[PDB]
Design the sequence.
């Protein structure tokens, strides 16, 4: 919440998973989009975004192709 | 996603007469129900359109043009008189009548409420730092929160209830503009500030700078002497360990002079027994109108021998 | 996700309700309505201290009409349904937190102390008519520090449906601290005193005991940190209905120093030694006096857990 | 809805997929978190949770590794 305390689970609007390959390392970023006016003005979780959240489990698949 | 991502919410956006007024609006712009007592103590943010619901519309028959744009224009232009008479004196909303520009003591309270989240959202953010217009006994002043640059534009985020919003008298958040008049102490075998007896001095003020601060009748005067640790930012001893009021007797050229004689042996010497009981204590002199009114005029918080 | 999961919503939140009201907006509000449902002009100061009867359609005039664009389904029927279903939270969030009418903002569920006043005001005809009748007897919803309780006026049967006839001003309606009309629900934990050449409650000195509480029933009443505690001992005639010594002739706060099995234990040692003996000089100055022990959180908060009001030697 | 009727689809806040292996059987549990104040006070869909809901299709992947 805006006062820094832990509030209820806000409602959700979107999830973005982004990945880019650079020299033998896959770089994965995430952002969970939630209702605004709940998160503080600045920080990791700010405005309408939870940036690279721990509240997310994803399965990473790898394979090779030509 | 980039940082431009934004969503709908359970919170009012920013894009009428009823029976839940005005408390419904206060929660809608973020006032917590735990602190709704301030809903009638502080107005809607002057930066937002809802504040101006109170006036007759600018298109209606015979109505004054009252908008947040015309508000911001006069605010930055320094036309502080036009705000009081056209907007402040005709607000009269939120069931409150004594809307005024906040005092320094009230801005002091507003910052504490903003930091502790007791206000609306636009104002919980607004009163953290900045330069704010204040008003004490018909006189405008600018106070600084956070030591911001002096070219920061003047902010009037909200008007407050004259009596309903309680001010905080300690000066911590809102740093004011205290006036120190150019004054000469004549010293020699005359002025004396040394332990073991009475403190006496004889100052001298300039007439042209007395008339700039509302002092044209140069006998409508009275003096106060303070003993204690002066404020680190403005230099005033706000809560002195020893306070003493004295009256003057002086009668010269293109400037005028005033004496001062503490009563230390026509009462307890204790001025010297407390001024010189702690090495950080200093003695400061304050000039008022005869009844304690007027622009407060301050001397330096002097050390021993006016140092 | 576990059962503690809770979310925001669109039905008991903001952004839905708009600046509108299904009631009539006028210049004699709300005092005309207060008189019209029977509040005497001699007691019109309570017009803003207690709401319109939740049993009547007028109470719901404050909200946007249920048919207008964007309104929540709010009616006296939906209120009573949630009431008898025990959904007190939805009442607080959907109705109470958004009443905001009668020019009063601090609308809350009445406390136990406030129902006590409401019964006195109802009997003395100082309320509206429907509420002058309602608060005579029945089971009433109360709320103290975020905790719901049911209080009983007149000793009615336990299966009487819960009544919330009106909400009150948190600070405007003054409560009565004496327990006469509204009888509450005090909690007595099952505890063992070890006695022997240990626990002692006899005249002539300091009172000491060593109890023992169970962990599983401490966690049911919000006590999982078994060192976040503090103790109070009371001396006087306990209440004839609940057994608590609400106004003891002698009150004393003490702190414990105990550390065993599937339960945990706590001591207690009165300071009656090396000061005035007067605990025993007042506990045994009247044969009807009894000694009672109370457990709170460290700062006096939490569900108040009470021991029996003991006679001499824990009898 | 709390009144027993079937209403519109409530808004969503989270989905949890949890799995536990016990004696050659994977026990799969799920929970869909939705806006509260719509579900009844008790039941499978209650409070703010749709417990192991049918309104969910998930793809189950299995493999073995050392």
Sequence:
């Amino acid at each position: 919440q805006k006062d820094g305390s832990k509030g209820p689970h806000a409602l959700l609007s979107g999830i973005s998973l982004n990945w880019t390959l650079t020299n033998k390392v896959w770089d994965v970023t995430a952002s969970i989009g939630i209702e605004s006016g709940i998160l503080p003005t600045s920080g990791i979780d700010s405005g309408s975004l939870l940036r690279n959240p721990k509240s997310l489990s994803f399965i990473a698949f790898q394979w090779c192709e030509n | 996603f980039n940082d431009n991502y934004s969503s709908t919410s359970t919170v009012y956006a920013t894009s009428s007469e009823h029976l839940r007024y005005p408390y419904l609006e206060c929660i809608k712009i973020g006032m917590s129900r735990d602190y709704l007592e301030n809903c009638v103590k502080v107005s809607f943010p002057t930066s937002q359109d809802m504040f101006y619901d109170a006036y007759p519309s600018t298109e209606s028959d015979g109505a004054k043009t009252r908008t947040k744009e015309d508000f911001s224009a006069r605010l930055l232009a320094g036309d502080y008189d036009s705000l009081q008479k056209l907007y402040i004196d005709f607000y009269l909303a939120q069931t409150t009548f004594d809307w005024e520009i906040p005092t320094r003591d009230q801005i002091e309270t507003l910052v504490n409420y903003a930091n502790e989240g007791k206000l609306s959202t636009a104002l919980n953010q607004e009163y953290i730092t900045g330069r704010f217009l204040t008003k004490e006994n018909g006189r405008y002043d600018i106070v600084n929160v956070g030591g911001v640059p002096d070219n920061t534009p003047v902010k009037l985020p909200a008007i407050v209830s004259k009596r309903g919003l309680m001010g905080t008298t300690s000066v911590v958040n809102a740093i004011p503009n205290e006036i120190y008049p150019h004054i000469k102490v004549y010293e020699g075998t005359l002025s004396r500030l040394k332990p073991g007896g009475a403190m006496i001095a004889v100052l001298e003020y300039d007439v042209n700078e007395l008339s700039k601060h509302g002092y044209t009748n140069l006998w409508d005067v009275q003096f106060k002497v303070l003993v204690g640790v002066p404020h680190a930012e403005t230099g005033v001893i706000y809560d002195p360990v020893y306070e003493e009021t004295v009256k003057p007797y002086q009668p010269l050229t293109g400037k005028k002079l005033y004496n001062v004689s503490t009563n230390d042996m026509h009462n307890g010497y204790k001025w010297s027994n407390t001024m010189f009981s702690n090495s950080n204590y200093k003695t400061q002199i304050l000039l008022t109108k005869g009844d304690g009114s007027g622009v407060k005029l301050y001397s330096k918080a002097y050390s021993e021998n006016f140092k």
Observations:
- Chain A touches chain D at residues 9-12, 55, 57, 59 (CB under 8 Å).
